[PDB]
Amino acid sequence: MRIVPFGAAREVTGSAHLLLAGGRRVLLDCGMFQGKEEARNHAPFGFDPKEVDAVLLTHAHLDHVGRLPKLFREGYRGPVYATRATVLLMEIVLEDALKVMDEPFFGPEDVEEALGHLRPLEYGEWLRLGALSLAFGQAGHLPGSAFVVAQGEGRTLVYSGDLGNREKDVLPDPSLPPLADLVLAEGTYGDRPHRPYRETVREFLEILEKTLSQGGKVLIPTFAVERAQEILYVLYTHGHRLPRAPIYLDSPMAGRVLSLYPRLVRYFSEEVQAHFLQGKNPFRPAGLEVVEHTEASKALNRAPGPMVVLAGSGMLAGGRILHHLKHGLSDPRNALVFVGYQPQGGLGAEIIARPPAVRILGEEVPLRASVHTLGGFSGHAGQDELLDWLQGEPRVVLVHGEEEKLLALGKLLALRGQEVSLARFGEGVPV
Ligand SMILES: [Zn+2]
Ligand SMILES: [Zn+2]
Numbered sequence: 001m002r003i004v005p006f007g008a009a010r011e012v013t014g015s016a017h018l019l020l021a022g023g024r025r026v027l028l029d030c031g032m033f034q035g036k037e038e039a040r041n042h043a044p045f046g047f048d049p050k051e052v053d054a055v056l057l058t059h060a061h062l063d064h065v066g067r068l069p070k071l072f073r074e075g076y077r078g079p080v081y082a083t084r085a086t087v088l089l090m091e092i093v094l095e096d097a098l099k100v101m102d103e104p105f106f107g108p109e110d111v112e113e114a115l116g117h118l119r120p121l122e123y124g125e126w127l128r129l130g131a132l133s134l135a136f137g138q139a140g141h142l143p144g145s146a147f148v149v150a151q152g153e154g155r156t157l158v159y160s161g162d163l164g165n166r167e168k169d170v171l172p173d174p175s176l177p178p179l180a181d182l183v184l185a186e187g188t189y190g191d192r193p194h195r196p197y198r199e200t201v202r203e204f205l206e207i208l209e210k211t212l213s214q215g216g217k218v219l220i221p222t223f224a225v226e227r228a229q230e231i232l233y234v235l236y237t238h239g240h241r242l243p244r245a246p247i248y249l250d251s252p253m254a255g256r257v258l259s260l261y262p263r264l265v266r267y268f269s270e271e272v273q274a275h276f277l278q279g280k281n282p283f284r285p286a287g288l289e290v291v292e293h294t295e296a297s298k299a300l301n302r303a304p305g306p307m308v309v310l311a312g313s314g315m316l317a318g319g320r321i322l323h324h325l326k327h328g329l330s331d332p333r334n335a336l337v338f339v340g341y342q343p344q345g346g347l348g349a350e351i352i353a354r355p356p357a358v359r360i361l362g363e364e365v366p367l368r369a370s371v372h373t374l375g376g377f378s379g380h381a382g383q384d385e386l387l388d389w390l391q392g393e394p395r396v397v398l399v400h401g402e403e404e405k406l407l408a409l410g411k412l413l414a415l416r417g418q419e420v421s422l423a424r425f426g427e428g429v430p431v
Pocket of ligand 2: 064162
């Protein structure tokens, strides 16, 4: 068989990998490009959508799944397999991008068309494409996230998909992959491990007990998919020693995603499933609110008292979070907490640098609130974890991640006796 990198090549967005084997052609993920690499969603996949036999989707994030509708707009009518959890989130994931997105490739008819071909495939459930044999394995990066195990023609291939951070408590641990002739694996964080989870939560709680006791605000830029609810989970557990204060989840989609969590209980960790059994939703702490429109959202900019805000655009420069950042942040009683590493070159990194003042929404805002950064609350497996997962696997082709980082992981794998390479766009790899 041969697998062909059509997406996350020396870059993190665009995940799309074509598998040519068993006299068949199956697409592994079909996501969009993001940020600066936008526009390329307008270009075409170096392959023919109409010649695809079937597509398997690992998790529902926008990369990995954002171009799928484009694949249908361009002909494809075969099935698209994913787990229920991925199927359900995906509708929210797409519908949203369809709206927010400007000069949008693909459109509404495309989304239903694409959505109409989703067929449920669960962990350890084998799909057969004539001589081809595929199964999903537990990845623990999002509810319903999987890695692909592909067997056929005496060989076995494993595409990692995004691998989760096994220290956190919400999702279940990623499973080790089976011994395979070749592994297509992600390298987001191939250059470093994350700061231990326990210490991060322990610190999170200090920043909260402080800011809140002094009547301050705790702004938390976060992603609306798994990230926000996970904070909420941290806030429910532990919410017995934290000062009473409203918890505004100022993001409709984090809302929609959250609403969906109870239908997905089987997709979470044992700890989490235990709470659900005991008739409790651990993703709704003390006084959670979920704001719906901007009037209410801006009223928060002026309201005082102790408060905790979770707002859209995790990597800043985007959502309601900026208005929250504009007012407040100029006040020392507050505290900004990043629950994801910020990309350098973008605001945030610019804020971490502690410049006396920052530019937000065309204004010059005095930076006086305390700023804290908590990688550790990361959703991807870190270097040390990527290493253990890859363990004893000959041949590894690194995809999904900035060149330098991908390489850093590569170096270590290489120094260990593993054959390593960095997938190139279009250049298929064998087996
Ligand atoms: Zn992901
Ligand atoms: Zn990804």
